[PDB]
Amino acid sequence: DASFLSSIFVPVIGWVVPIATFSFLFLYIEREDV
Amino acid sequence: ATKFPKFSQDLAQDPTTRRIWYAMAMGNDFESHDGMTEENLYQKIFATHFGHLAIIFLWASSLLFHVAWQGNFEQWIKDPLHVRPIAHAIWDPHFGKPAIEAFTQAGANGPVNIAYSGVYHWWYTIGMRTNTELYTGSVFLLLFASLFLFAGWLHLQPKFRPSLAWFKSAESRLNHHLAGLFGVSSLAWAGHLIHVAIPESRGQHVGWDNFLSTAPHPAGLQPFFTGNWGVYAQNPDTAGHIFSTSQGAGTAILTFLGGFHPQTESLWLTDMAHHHLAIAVLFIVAGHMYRTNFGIGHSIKEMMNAKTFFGKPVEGPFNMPHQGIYDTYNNSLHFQLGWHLACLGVVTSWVAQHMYSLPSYAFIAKDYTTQAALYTHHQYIAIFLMVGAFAHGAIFLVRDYDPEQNKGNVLERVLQHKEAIISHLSWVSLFLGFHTLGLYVHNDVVVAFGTPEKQILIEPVFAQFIQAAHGKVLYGLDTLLSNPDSVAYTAYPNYANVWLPGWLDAINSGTNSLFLTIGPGDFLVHHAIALGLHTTTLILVKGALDARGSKLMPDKKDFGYAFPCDGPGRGGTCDISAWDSFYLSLFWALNTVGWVTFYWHWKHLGIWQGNVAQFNENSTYLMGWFRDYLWANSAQLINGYNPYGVNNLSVWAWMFLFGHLVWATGFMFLISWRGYWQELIETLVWAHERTPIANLVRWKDKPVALSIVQARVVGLAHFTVGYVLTYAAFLIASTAGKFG
Amino acid sequence: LEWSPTVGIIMVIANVIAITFGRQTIKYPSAEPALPSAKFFGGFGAPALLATTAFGHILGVGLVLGLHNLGRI
Amino acid sequence: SSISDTQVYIALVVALIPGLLAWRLATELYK
Amino acid sequence: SHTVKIYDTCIGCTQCVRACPTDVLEMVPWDGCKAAQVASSPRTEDCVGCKRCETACPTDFLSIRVYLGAETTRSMGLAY
Amino acid sequence: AKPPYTFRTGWALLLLAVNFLVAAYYFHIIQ
Numbered sequence: 001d002a003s004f005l006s007s008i009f010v011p012v013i014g015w016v017v018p019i020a021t022f023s024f025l026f027l028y029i030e031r032e033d034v
Numbered sequence: 035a036t037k038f039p040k041f042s043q044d045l046a047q048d049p050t051t052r053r054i055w056y057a058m059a060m061g062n063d064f065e066s067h068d069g070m071t072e073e074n075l076y077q078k079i080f081a082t083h084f085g086h087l088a089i090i091f092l093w094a095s096s097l098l099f100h101v102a103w104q105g106n107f108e109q110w111i112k113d114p115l116h117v118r119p120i121a122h123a124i125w126d127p128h129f130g131k132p133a134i135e136a137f138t139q140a141g142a143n144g145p146v147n148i149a150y151s152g153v154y155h156w157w158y159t160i161g162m163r164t165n166t167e168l169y170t171g172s173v174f175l176l177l178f179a180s181l182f183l184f185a186g187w188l189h190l191q192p193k194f195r196p197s198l199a200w201f202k203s204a205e206s207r208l209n210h211h212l213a214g215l216f217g218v219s220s221l222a223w224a225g226h227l228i229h230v231a232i233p234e235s236r237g238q239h240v241g242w243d244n245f246l247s248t249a250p251h252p253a254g255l256q257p258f259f260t261g262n263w264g265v266y267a268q269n270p271d272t273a274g275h276i277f278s279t280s281q282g283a284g285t286a287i288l289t290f291l292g293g294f295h296p297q298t299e300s301l302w303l304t305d306m307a308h309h310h311l312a313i314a315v316l317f318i319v320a321g322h323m324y325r326t327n328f329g330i331g332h333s334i335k336e337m338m339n340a341k342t343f344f345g346k347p348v349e350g351p352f353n354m355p356h357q358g359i360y361d362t363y364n365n366s367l368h369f370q371l372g373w374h375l376a377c378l379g380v381v382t383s384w385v386a387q388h389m390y391s392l393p394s395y396a397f398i399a400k401d402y403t404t405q406a407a408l409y410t411h412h413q414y415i416a417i418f419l420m421v422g423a424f425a426h427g428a429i430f431l432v433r434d435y436d437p438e439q440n441k442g443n444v445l446e447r448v449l450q451h452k453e454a455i456i457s458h459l460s461w462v463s464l465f466l467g468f469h470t471l472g473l474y475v476h477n478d479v480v481v482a483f484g485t486p487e488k489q490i491l492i493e494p495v496f497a498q499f500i501q502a503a504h505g506k507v508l509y510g511l512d513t514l515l516s517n518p519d520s521v522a523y524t525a526y527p528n529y530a531n532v533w534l535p536g537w538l539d540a541i542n543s544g545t546n547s548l549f550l551t552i553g554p555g556d557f558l559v560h561h562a563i564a565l566g567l568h569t570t571t572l573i574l575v576k577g578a579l580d581a582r583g584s585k586l587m588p589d590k591k592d593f594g595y596a597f598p599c600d601g602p603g604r605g606g607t608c609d610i611s612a613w614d615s616f617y618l619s620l621f622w623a624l625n626t627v628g629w630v631t632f633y634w635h636w637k638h639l640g641i642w643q644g645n646v647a648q649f650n651e652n653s654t655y656l657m658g659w660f661r662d663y664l665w666a667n668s669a670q671l672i673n674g675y676n677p678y679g680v681n682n683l684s685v686w687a688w689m690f691l692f693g694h695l696v697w698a699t700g701f702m703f704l705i706s707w708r709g710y711w712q713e714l715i716e717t718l719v720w721a722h723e724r725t726p727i728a729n730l731v732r733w734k735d736k737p738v739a740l741s742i743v744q745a746r747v748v749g750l751a752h753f754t755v756g757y758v759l760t761y762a763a764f765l766i767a768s769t770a771g772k773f774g
Numbered sequence: 775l776e777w778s779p780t781v782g783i784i785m786v787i788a789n790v791i792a793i794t795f796g797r798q799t800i801k802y803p804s805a806e807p808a809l810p811s812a813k814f815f816g817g818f819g820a821p822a823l824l825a826t827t828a829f830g831h832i833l834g835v836g837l838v839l840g841l842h843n844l845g846r847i
Numbered sequence: 848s849s850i851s852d853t854q855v856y857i858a859l860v861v862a863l864i865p866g867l868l869a870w871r872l873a874t875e876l877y878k
Numbered sequence: 879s880h881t882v883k884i885y886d887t888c889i890g891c892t893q894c895v896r897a898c899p900t901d902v903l904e905m906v907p908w909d910g911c912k913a914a915q916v917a918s919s920p921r922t923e924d925c926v927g928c929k930r931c932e933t934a935c936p937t938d939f940l941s942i943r944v945y946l947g948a949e950t951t952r953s954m955g956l957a958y
Numbered sequence: 959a960k961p962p963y964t965f966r967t968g969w970a971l972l973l974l975a976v977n978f979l980v981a982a983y984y985f986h987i988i989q
């Protein structure tokens with residue numbers, strides 16, 4: 001009865017991972033430290 | 035420099051948005067990273083090999099996990115012919131209720147995707163029977179990928195970084211790859227087949243719980259050491275055998291039967307076990323050839339530089355100068371990469387050519403959409419690997435080749451007459467193209483004018499002879515294996531061709547893809563295939579051999595592999611670099627695999643309906659292709675959704691339109707070039723700096739149009755993604771709509 | 775488990791494996807009472823010799839009881 | 848029908864191990 | 879910036895200096911040709927990379943060459 | 959060098975002879 005995991009993981013993969021990933025990568029490519 | 039990307043001070047100081055794109059496209063080019071030595075190059079590559087390998091094993095773990103948790107594998111065991119396999123579940127909030135109803139298929143509780151990769155046939159053939167076995171496989175691959183991830187981390191540590199001498203020790207790596215990675219891995223696969231896969235096919239459960247108890251053969255290891263090896267071939271499986279059951283099951287573990295199993299229409303498991311044992315012994319024997327720390331063996335470098343043939347002076351092996359070829363191979367990673375991509379692409383084509391003809395997985399020869407997707411998959415992977423082979427040959431010739439160390443050898447001789455090679459490829463390509471197109475257009479015109487008997491129809495008598503040399507009685511040539519009086523049939527001094535009755539039984543039944551009957555349409559499409567291969571080779575070989583310089587640009591090696599052009603002068607120099615022959619050849623390669631997969635699919639789609647006459651009568655003119663293959667098979671695809679509703683082919687309809695869109699978007703990058711878009715973006719920059727409230731924010735890095743080479747990249751990537759996704763949607767939906 | 779010469783040869787094989795490991799990786803194999811041959815023994819003391827054969831009996835008893843528990847011997 | 852909830856939870860906990868090892872390897876390859 | 883280098887097969891016909899839209903090139907005294915002058919590229923930071931100098935060069939393959947390198951605001955030709 | 963070209967035409971005649979052998983099996987001259 002672990003079919004409820006999809007309603008967690010598919011929003012995480014579709015929204016949380018892109019927002020966190022693109023936020024990291026955007027602030028990293030605009031950073032002037034390294 | 036002081037900012038991303040860290041590996042390029044030149045890119046890091048770029049003030050424009052080009053910095054980001056070229057940072058992405060140069061991230062895996064470790065040689066062009068700043069401060070890169072050769073030892074750090076090899077060490078970094080070794081670690082990325084481990085990480086990549088872990089990506090592969092996590093992927094295979096995913097396959098096992100989704101079939102185990104979401105598939106219907108245990109229900110598919112009891113009926114592989116009538117049950118649809120499940121890939122994974124669908125969780126999509128965008129689906130309406132008719133869509134959710136349309137994908138609730140294959141006896142599933144909710145919406146699911148059907149698997150077309152044949153992983154059920156493969157896991158069932160090699161002995162898996164339950165969902166827990168798939169589960170333990172996936173967890174084992176999770177820990178196995180953990181092992182490789184840790185190994186790649188560990189060989190970046192200072193005590194465990196290998197030396198540059200370790201990487202360039204080629205004879206030890208060849209001995210270990212031939213002996214271990216091929217030989218022992220094939221021996222262990224024979225051990226798996228004999229211990230697990232054959233007893234599971236005979237109804238007997240063998241697991242980790244009881245394999246140390248269970249002997250595979252009732253005379254276990256006594257006739258092996260006494261030399262009475264024929265005991266393991268006695269009592270094979272009968273022709274009344276039913277797979278995964280005890281009825282008709284023999285006790286033999288190493289047979290030599292030949293042909294296909296009668297029920298499953300695939301190769302015998304005992305033949306495959308005997309196969310992997312035989313080539314295991316032979317690869318282990320091969321892995322003792324070269325010299326290592328133990329004195330005996332061959333030095334490949336002494337074999338290249340050898341100049342005497344039993345006291346008679348020669349130029350080298352086969353009287354050919356090979357001095358420096360060892361160092362040319364061993365010191366260049368691009369020579370090695372192009373060479374391995376060539377061999378791996380040939381092997382990938384050879385896999386695709388043998389998995390439809392000689393299937394090895396139980397009941398996969400009746401799963402048509404799987405057969406189609408697997409052939410087309412491996413042929414596309416193979417043309418990509420061949421294009422990469424010649425691309426890295428060109429990168430070798432630009433970056434890593436020197437003619438001083440290769441002075442007088444065979445590669446320099448090939449460079450010395452490169453215009454002869456290129457002009458003869460040009461001649462063979464024109465000579466095939468004019469006449470193949472000419473016969474097609476002749477046949478089109480004469481069939482259009484109501485007179486189809488005026489077609490130029492040419493029998494493929496040579497390949498029909500080869501099929502008759504294999505025992506195919508249908509042509510009536512009465513040659514080597516079709517002639518029972520022949521010495522090749524009887525094997526006159528020894529009479530030991532044990533494979534031959536089952537082989538002729540398999541080749542003379544017309545109910546499989548084992549040497550399909552061929553006619554004039556097969557002739558015409560094979561010369562289209564030869565045109566495609568020769569022309570793709572022309573583009574690739576020309577760009578490799580002109581990579582260092584041509585008459586239009588003699589100093590081309592001074593600019594690298596990929597550069598836009600040499601400017602407007604000397605007539606204009608668009609697409610002059612060696613990278614541009616990659617670019618131009620990828621079109622010809624996709625075209626070629628389009629022709630071979632159209633031909634595969636339409637011939638087999640005539641087979642699977644009992645109407646071979648459609649292909650045999652209509653493939654000789656191009657309207658027959660355009661009408662009976664493209665137009666006729668796409669109907670149930672394009673009705674995947676319509677004003678009346680939806681069905682299970684609606685993803686394939688949406689993907690078909692999607693692939694057309696991505697392919698057509700590629701034309702924008704391939705036709706429109708840069709300065710148009712740069713002049714456009716400049717007015718956009720003006721408007722953003724003049725627009726109030728929008729003036730509050732702006733860019734940090736300046737908007738510029740994509741570069742010329744980047745445009746060719748983005749356009750070709752669109753073209754190929756649209757090409758693949760369009761043909762995949764059409765292939766899967768046409769075959770799965772006509773055959774479930 | 776009735777005694778057969780297969781049990782004898784698996785005890786001898788475990789003794790040979792243990793004397794192989796005892797020759798390869800004992801830190802001090804040459805103790806004070808040495809063997810009279812010291813050429814068929816590789817160079818030992820008598821206590822290192824019967825240490826290796828006692829560990830071979832550990833391995834051999836474990837092997838033959840495990841293989842009897844499976845069903846092989 | 849399928850595998851249980853305990854097996855999916857155990858597989859996720861096991862998959863945390865190549866996740867951590869992949870994080871270390873990707874940072875080492877950059878370093 | 880881009881790299882513009884002048885090879886010794888120059889004949890000093892000054893056409894590269896005239897073709898240059900951003901004043902990279904100038905003519906300096908020399909003695910290896912009849913015209914007693916080579917081209918020289920001191921302002922390669924102004925070089926946009928358009929290669930009009932290579933179009934203008936009359937020698938059989940190019941006494942002058944432009945090697946495209948790192949991009950700046952000047953070499954990309956941005957007014958913004 | 960080698961105006962008779964005796965080495966490269968030995969292998970060319972050998973390949974052509976193997977070709978005539980396969981063609982001799984084709985036209986049923988040798989069975």
Ligand code: CLA
Binds near residue numbers: 080083204211215
């Ligand atoms: C017995 C010892 C041994 C073994 C097993 C290996 C194994 C390997 N080495 Mg290694 N190596 C060794 C000794 C050994 N090495 C020694 C002594 C040295 C020092 C000289 C090296 C130095 C070395 C380097 C420097 C590198 C490797 C690499 C590799 C990997 C190759 C990539 C791969 O996945 O191949 C897998 C290939 C096969 C399993 C067989 C070939 C595949 C065939 C073509 C397919 C056809 C078979 C069959 C039809 C497939 C069935 C399909 C079905 C399963 C679906 C592989 C894991 C590379 C690597 O990845 O590093 C991590 C690498 O960079 N080796």
Ligand code: CLA
Binds near residue numbers: 059613616
């Ligand atoms: C074993 C295989 C192998 C290996 C190790 C390499 C390794 C390398 N290649 Mg190579 N190559 C290969 C196969 C391989 N290639 C093949 C098969 C081809 C033919 C297609 C080529 C063609 C090729 C060219 C033409 C070039 C290289 C280059 C390079 C170097 C840098 C790569 C880089 O940074 O790209 C960065 C990676 C990216 C920018 C990612 C691009 C991702 C592509 C476009 C796919 C993305 C599409 C998208 C995700 C699809 C999904 C969309 C969805 C809607 C469905 C590196 C040495 C370059 C080089 O440095 O040579 C000097 C170079 O110019 N290769």
Ligand code: CLA
Binds near residue numbers: 461464465466468
């Ligand atoms: C019935 C209609 C027909 C038509 C319309 C054509 C049309 C064409 N043929 Mg074709 N051909 C045909 C029948 C036909 N062919 C048949 C039945 C054969 C079998 C013998 C050939 C064999 C053939 C060859 C071998 C070649 C052509 C070529 C050509 C093209 C140029 C022809 C020409 O005279 O150029 C004017 C002539 C020249 C520019 C130079 C002379 C070259 C000629 C063709 C060969 C002379 C060499 C000599 C006789 C030794 C021959 C060697 C050969 C056996 C390999 C043109 C597209 C040429 C081609 O495709 O090149 C790309 C070419 O090389 N054809």
Ligand code: CLA
Binds near residue numbers: 467
């Ligand atoms: C339908 C599309 C199409 C066609 C027919 C061709 C045709 C050709 N390409 Mg090609 N190409 C195409 C698309 C196409 N390309 C695309 C999309 C790309 C990607 C950019 C390329 C990239 C490409 C490269 C990079 C190369 C080729 C090459 C070739 C030649 C291959 C040899 C051959 O077949 O000779 C036979 C010729 C033909 C089949 C075409 C012309 C025959 C016509 C019918 C002759 C009769 C004309 C008749 C008088 C009617 C004219 C009416 C008029 C008077 C008004 C040939 C000219 C290679 C080449 O030039 O080799 C030397 C080469 O190097 N092409």
Ligand SMILES: CC1=C(/C=C/C(C)=C/C=C/C(C)=C/C=C/C=C(C)/C=C/C=C(C)/C=C/C2=C(C)CCCC2(C)C)C(C)(C)CCC1
Binds near residue numbers: 376380
């Ligand atoms: C049929 C048959 C047979 C035969 C076989 C054969 C003999 C085969 C062959 C095959 C082959 C023989 C193949 C080939 C392949 C090849 C290729 C695929 C190539 C490629 C190449 C490349 C790609 C190159 C590259 C480069 C460059 C360009 C530059 C420099 C560098 C390099 C070199 C890398 C037998 C007798 C067994 C039996 C019966 C059947």
Ligand code: SF4
Binds near residue numbers: 898899
């Ligand atoms: S590339 Fe352009 S700016 Fe540079 S020297 Fe030539 S003409 Fe002048």
Ligand code: SF4
Binds near residue numbers: 916
């Ligand atoms: S055009 Fe060439 S040869 Fe003439 S002055 Fe300029 S660099 Fe010299």
